[PDB]
Ligand binder design. Structure first.
Ligand SMILES: OCCCNc1cc(N2CCc3ccccc3CC2)nc(-c2ccccn2)n1
Ligand SMILES: [Fe+2]
Ligand SMILES: [Zn+2]
Length: 443
């Protein structure tokens, strides 16, 4: 169909007025738009993209760590097996480390070498992609992070309307910025964002990137291709065959992101990306306060448990922080959060009563304010409020956390464990009771 290659939802910005215009964030967060490309964003805001140029990064922090992914230079939009006889989904990539200075040399010499070649089915060249460069330290990247505060509020790393701001602690690469340094053919394999949170990506240039996007409600189709072809959807590297997708009637959005264009990946959108030239990119996540974002984040949280995959966003901890500190005026969002909190509260009361009925002591432990969420040291599930810690770890004050299930499996009557309580039931009951719909006259 004509419907399988739809146009890209695109906003064309000329000036600051266009950037701060409220219908912009409404357009981005609209679930009908799986991706929005905000063209001319850097130029409209007079953002200095030079602060993220390779030359400036080397000057700034030359020994800064870079995760290198070594990949094959594949033709156009295809992915061929090593031999060059068939198109396959699987893509191979080894990981190593280098520094900004060393990767910069490679990026620069790669460009010089292509100029020289320009003046002179397999097999494929090997290229290196500089990935996951951690721009979290404000003392190392002061000017860079300050430049990003010039964005409109809805797209910033930190803002009142961002769920990831309400988490109350750092989640690396989600509420901190990551940088990517690229050469032609540097590929980002197919994926969804952590816990289906929206992402913001700005191309620093000077080259272009080519994006491929499938709406969230088709992710189950791609999951099936992965299972059929012996791939883990969440954990393997794969590059979809567009003819497979065409055949299965999956619509594919496809577009070029030029320097200074911002790409908004909406909640749960499946996407993959390749550099067309030499460029850098910066990216982070944002969680808009919408029913759709919250719903998709909870669904993925629950799906991750089934797949034994850690959720980077602690949705229980987050949901309590929303109830404590956010006046929520959307009826559909409010009812989702309320329902979730009730589930948490009931499950916690059931467990706590079973412990007390078995004669197991619950130790008041409290909590430092701003203390991060805890995860089970064995299975990596989020553990809320009741923490299971071995007698020895308790004595040593290391407080290594287990979930109830993992503690039970280790020690059948919990004889090896103490149960630590970080919040009184009465306090949580009140936060729940005092969490009510705020009236708003807007839509
Ligand atoms: O525009 C730049 C950013 C493109 N987006 C990327 C790149 C990337 N890199 C690491 C993954 C990887 C593995 C193997 C080969 C290549 C890559 C891509 C880099 N990882 C992610 C990511 C990871 C976890 C959750 C959400 N997103 N997003
Ligand atoms: Fe990503
Ligand atoms: Zn566990």
């Amino acid at each position: 169909k004509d419907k399988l290659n739809p146009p890209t939802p695109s906003i064309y910005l000329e000036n600051k007025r266009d950037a701060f215009f409220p219908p912009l964030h409404q357009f981005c967060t609209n679930p009908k738009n799986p991706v929005t490309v905000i063209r001319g964003l850097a130029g409209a805001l007079k953002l200095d993209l030079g602060l993220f140029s390779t030359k400036t990064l080397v000057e700034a922090n030359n020994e800064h760590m870079v995760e290198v992914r070594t990949q094959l230079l594949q033709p156009a939009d295809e992915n061929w097996d090593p031999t060059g006889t068939k198109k396959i989904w699987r893509c191979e990539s080894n990981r190593s480390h280098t520094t900004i200075a060393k990767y910069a040399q490679y990026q620069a010499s790669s460009f010089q070498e292509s100029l020289r070649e320009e003046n002179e089915k397999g097999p494929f060249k090997t290229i290196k992609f500089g990935t996951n460069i951690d721009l979290s330290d404000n003392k190392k990247w002061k000017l860079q992070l300050h430049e990003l505060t010039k964005l409109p509020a809805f797209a910033r790393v930190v803002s009142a309307g961002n769920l990831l701001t309400h988490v109350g602690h750092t989640i690396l690469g989600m509420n901190t910025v990551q940088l990517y340094m690229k050469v032609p053919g540097s590929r980002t394999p197919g994926h969804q964002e952590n816990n289906n949170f929206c992402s913001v990506n700005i191309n620093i240039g000077p080259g272009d990137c080519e994006w491929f996007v499938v709406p969230e409600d088709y992710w189950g189709v791609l999951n099936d291709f992965c299972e059929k072809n012996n791939l883990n959807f969440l954990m393997s590297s794969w590059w979809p065959n567009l003819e497979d997708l065409y055949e299965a009637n999956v619509p594919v959005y496809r577009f070029i992101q030029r320097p200074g264009d911002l790409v908004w990946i909406n909640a749960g959108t499946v996407h993959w990306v390749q550099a067309v030239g030499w460029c850098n990119n910066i990216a982070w996540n944002v969680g808009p306060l919408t029913a759709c974002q919250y719903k998709l984040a909870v669904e993925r949280y629950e799906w991750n448990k089934l797949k034994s995959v850690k959720s980077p966003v602690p949705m229980v901890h987050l949901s309590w922080n929303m109830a404590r500190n956010i006046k929520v005026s959307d009826p559909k969002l409010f009812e989702m959060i309320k329902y979730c909190l009730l589930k948490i509260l009931k499950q916690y009361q059931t467990l706590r009563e079973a412990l007390v009925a078995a004669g197991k002591e619950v130790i008041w432990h409290g909590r430092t304010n701003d203390e991060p969420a805890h995860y089970c040291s064995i299975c990596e599930v989020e553990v809320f409020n009741l923490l299971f810690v071995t007698n020895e770890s308790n004595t040593q004050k290391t407080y290594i956390v287990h979930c109830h299930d993992c503690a039970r499996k280790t020690s059948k009557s919990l004889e090896n464990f103490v149960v630590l309580e970080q919040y009184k039931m009465e306090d949580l009951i009140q936060v729940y009771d005092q969490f009510t719909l705020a009236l708003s006259l807007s839509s």
